[PDB]
RNA sequence: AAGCUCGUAUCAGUUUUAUG
RNA sequence: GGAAUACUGCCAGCUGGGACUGAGGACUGCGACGUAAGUCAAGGAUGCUGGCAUAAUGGUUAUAUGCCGCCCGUCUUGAAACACGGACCAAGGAGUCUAACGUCUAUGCGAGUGUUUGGGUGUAAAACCCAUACGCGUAAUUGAACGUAGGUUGGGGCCUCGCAAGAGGUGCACAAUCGACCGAUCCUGGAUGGAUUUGGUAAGAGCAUAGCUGUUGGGACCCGAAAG
RNA sequence: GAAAUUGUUGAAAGGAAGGGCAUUUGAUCAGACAUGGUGUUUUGUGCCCUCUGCUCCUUGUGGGUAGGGGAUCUCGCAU
């Protein structure tokens, strides 16, 4: 089992350090899933398009359930009515960031999401397709 | 002015005090529970000793009555046999090696308790040249459990030195003391398999007085060391222990 | 940190089995039938 | 401190390091399959292995009980003020005798043990 | 070597019963 | 008739002698002694004594003593063996570079990506920017929104119920089933209605650079042969 | 100015030598300018008591530096 991040980015190392403590001291499996995903390689972390988030936000009660992505969020011109919601991801593209902000939503980092939801209440983790 | 304490320090102190106010009460609760558990263990041990004494006295009385009555008394077949590995890993044939592995006999001078059953009899017959077995007594089982009894805490090997260790793992089945484990080992209860698997395979040293016979690799009935040594298995285990 | 061996060092033996005191009260082993 | 148990005091020597002059004493593992040393037959030179590992609590500690620490100048020497008992100041071989006396004076002032005092000096 | 699920009912150079 | 003794086994019975071991490093716990204070052999040696600065001890090497050890590397082969080379020493000596095609890892951007063929600039082969084109992908069995650009069943995860076991609600990727347009089988007669499987949309996931690593051609890990 | 190699002095050992485990003997090398720490008793000093000043910031639970008066003095040092 992958136990350390191969990425040399110090910020990702700090995120891993925080998430390990959160998972070990909280016991909530939500932190464990994010910590495990943080070790996934770039090929194993496909981007999640804003269209994917918008279509996944049709889930019941998803308006108040902040969506979480462990990879990168990319813009999508195929849609024009992105729901007003908060999205948390490591990196947000300029187009995706503008679309999310313009729609009245907000974009936050993983640490901000963890502080807001230490136990992961109402969280929704999305994973990009591999096929 | 008086330097005020840091707000973070104040919160930390308040949290520590709140946690200690519960830890202190939990300590007293644990002490009371330990006292009650010790009393229960004492009464259970007394009951087990009484049961063993009554059983042996009844067996002896039945034998004497049968002798006096001019009849034959068929003693109950032993339902528990201990097995010890006598041969090394080298050159062991494949099927006997697999049988020994299934019996947790991974090294020489190691043994475990095996329930006597119709199926296990054939398994024992299949590994006679490599293992010596017999019917252990209460004293031998108690000595083994006390001296080389190790508990398996879900992945590992832990020495059995406290009833709390047994209770934390075997307490699910009502076993809360070393005496309870010994009773469940000598008597094949419903939870015999769980107790047997919980105990780590015994690591026994070579006999203090030697194996006696000049050659070990022979049947015990012909001056050897393996095979059925029902009565002498206790002596062999005690010498090895 | 160190495994105390029962059957000796009576102090540890009593911890494992509180009935050992009652056993030693009459020695529980020379009972006459 | 814990006893300094040296698992192997004898210096390891390469096979045939003395039979032929072209073979350096520096240890080198035999690569040939037929080599007896590689098979560690009885009576052959001992082969270094993980077993001879020294314990951490006594690793790198000299018999005097102080760890060696190379010192180049007074600035380096002053760093051992808080670790005099555990560390000892060792003067480098390239230090001129002019600075050696000054370094020794500071070591004595701070009480830092010197592994090789009086080197290049005369009384 | 790396990704999914599952630590579960997944198996066994082991044995016995039933289908000859 | 009755003692015993002989033999097997038990003692959570008692009592010595001999050898090694002293590991952890302020208290957290299981236990015993005692009405309590306190003590203890109870999760690892405590105290005393004896030798010492012309020290005590330890270290390097020659021989010697009890025992062991066929001469080094390569290839034959299933083996041991033959054999191939080795008089000795200082220096020299060998999977290195390049072009294409890939996996994995890391970085930047991201449906965009690649400044450096060049132009501007310049403390000048240094350093810093990009107007126009260009390679890649961004969609094709003509064209894919009617719907999570899909119903149902599982599915990391989240929420309510609950002290737990567990119940209910909601579900990314992924898997099974069945789904929508639009074309070929193969009918039907240039269509029409469709037989039963068909390959896309399904929902972008890609572009640039750094590292190990694989294949091919270049001298290709190094040395060497009849020839033209 | 090192080896292969060669000659002398010394030690050792003698149809061979070479290496490993443990040790005696012979030769020989290291083996603290460590000379302390604690409480008490005289005396002289200062950064020590008191009076009078100057100077840096900011402003602060400070720093630096002067001129008059003594051994209430162990606050440190030296005896």
Shape of chain C: elongated
Number of strands of chain C: 0
> How much of the polypeptide of chain C forms β-strand, as a percent range?
under 5%
Give the overall form of chain B: elongated
* Total domain count of chain B: 1
Q: Name the structural class of chain C.
A: mainly alpha
- What oligomeric assembly is this protein in? part of a larger assembly
Query: How many DSSP helices of chain C?
Result: 2
Strand content of chain B: 5-15%
For the termini of chain B, the CA-CA separation is: 74 Å
SS content category of chain B: alpha+beta
- Binned, the helix content of chain C reads 40-55%
Q: Say how many strands of chain B there are.
A: 7
Biggest sheet descriptor of chain C:
none
CA gyration radius of chain C, whole angstroms: 12 Å
Q: Portion of residues in helices of chain B?
A: 40-55%
Subcellular location (chain D): Cytoplasm
Protein name (chain D): Large ribosomal subunit protein eL32
Keywords (chain D): Cytoplasm, Phosphoprotein, Ribonucleoprotein, Ribosomal protein
GO molecular function, one term (chain D): structural constituent of ribosome
Record the SSE blueprint.
The structure is cut from a larger assembly and holds chains A (131 residues), B (241 residues), C (33 residues) and D (123 residues).
Chain A: H1 10-26, H2 29-38, E1 48-49, H3 50-56, E2 67-69, E3 72-74, E4 86-88, E5 91-92, H4 94-102, E6 106-108, H5 110-116, E7 124-126
Parallel strand pairs in A: 1-3, 2-4, 2-7, 3-5, 4-6
Helix pairs in contact in A: 1-2
Chain B: H1 7-68, E1 80-85, H2 94-102, E2 110-115, H3 118-126, E3 131-134, H4 138-148, E4 150-151, E5 158-159, H5 163-170, H6 178-186, H7 192-198, E6 202-203, E7 227-228, H8 232-240
Helix pairs in contact in B: 4-6
Chain C: H1 10-16, H2 19-26
Chain A binds 3 RNA strands through helix 2, strand 1, helix 3, helix 4 and strand 7.
């Amino acid at each position: 089992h992958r136990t350390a991040p191969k990425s040399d980015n110090v910020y990702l190392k700090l995120l891993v350090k925080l998430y390990t403590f959160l998972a070990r001291r909280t016991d909530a499996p939500f932190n464990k899933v994010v910590l495990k995903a943080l070790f996934l390689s770039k090929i194993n972390r496909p981007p999640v398009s804003v269209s994917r988030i918008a279509r996944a936000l049709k889930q019941e009660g998803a308006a108040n359930k902040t969506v979480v992505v462990v990879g990168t969020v990319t813009d999508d011109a195929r849609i024009f009515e992105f729901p007003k919601t908060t999205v948390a991801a490591l990196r947000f593209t300029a187009g995706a960031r503008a679309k999310i902000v313009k729609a009245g939503g907000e974009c936050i980092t993983l640490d901000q999401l963890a502080v807001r939801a230490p136990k992961g209440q109402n969280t929704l983790i999305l994973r990009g397709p591999r096929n | 002015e008086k330097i005020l304490t840091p707000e973070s320090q104040l919160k930390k102190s308040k949290a520590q005090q709140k946690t200690a106010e519960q830890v202190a009460a939990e300590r007293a609760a644990r002490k009371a529970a330990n006292k009650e558990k010790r009393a229960i263990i004492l009464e259970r041990n007394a009951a087990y000793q009484k049961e063993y004494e009554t059983a042996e006295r009844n067996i002896i009385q039945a034998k004497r009555d049968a002798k006096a009555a001019g009849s034959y008394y068929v003693e109950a077949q032993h339902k528990l046999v201990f097995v010890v590995r006598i041969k090394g890993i080298n050159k062991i044939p494949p099927k006997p090696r697999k049988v020994l592995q299934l019996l947790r006999l991974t090294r020489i001078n190691s043994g475990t308790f095996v329930k006597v059953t119709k199926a296990t009899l054939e398994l024992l017959k299949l590994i006679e040249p490599y293992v010596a077995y017999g019917y252990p007594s209460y004293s031998t089982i108690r000595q083994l459990v006390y001296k080389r009894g190790f508990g398996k805490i879900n992945k590992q090997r832990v020495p059995l030195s406290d009833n709390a260790i047994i209770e934390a793992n075997l307490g699910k089945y009502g076993i809360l003391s070393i005496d309870d484990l010994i009773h469940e080992i000598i008597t094949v209860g419903p939870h015999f398999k769980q107790a047997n698997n919980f105990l780590w395979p015994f690591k026994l040293s070579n006999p203090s007085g030697g194996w006696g016979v000049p050659r070990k690799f022979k049947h015990f009935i012909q001056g050897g060391s393996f095979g059925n040594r029902e009565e002498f298995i206790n002596k062999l285990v005690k010498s090895m222990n | 940190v160190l495994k105390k061996n029962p059957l000796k060092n009576k102090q540890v033996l009593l911890r494992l089995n509180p009935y050992a005191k009652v056993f030693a009260a009459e020695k529980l082993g020379s009972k006459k039938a | 401190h814990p006893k300094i148990v040296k698992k192997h005091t004898k210096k390891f020597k390469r096979h045939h390091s003395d039979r032929y002059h072209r073979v350096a004493e520096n240890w080198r593992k035999q690569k040939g399959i037929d080599s007896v040393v590689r098979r560690r037959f009885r009576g052959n030179i001992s082969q270094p292995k993980i077993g001879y590992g020294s314990n951490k609590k006594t690793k790198f500690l000299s018999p005097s009980g102080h760890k060696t620490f190379l010192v180049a100048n007074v600035k380096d020497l002053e760093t051992l003020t808080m670790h005099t008992k555990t560390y000892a100041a060792e003067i480098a071989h390239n230090i001129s005798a002019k600075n050696r006396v000054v370094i020794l004076a500071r070591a004595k002032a701070l009480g830092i043990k010197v592994t090789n005092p009086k080197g290049r000096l005369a009384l």
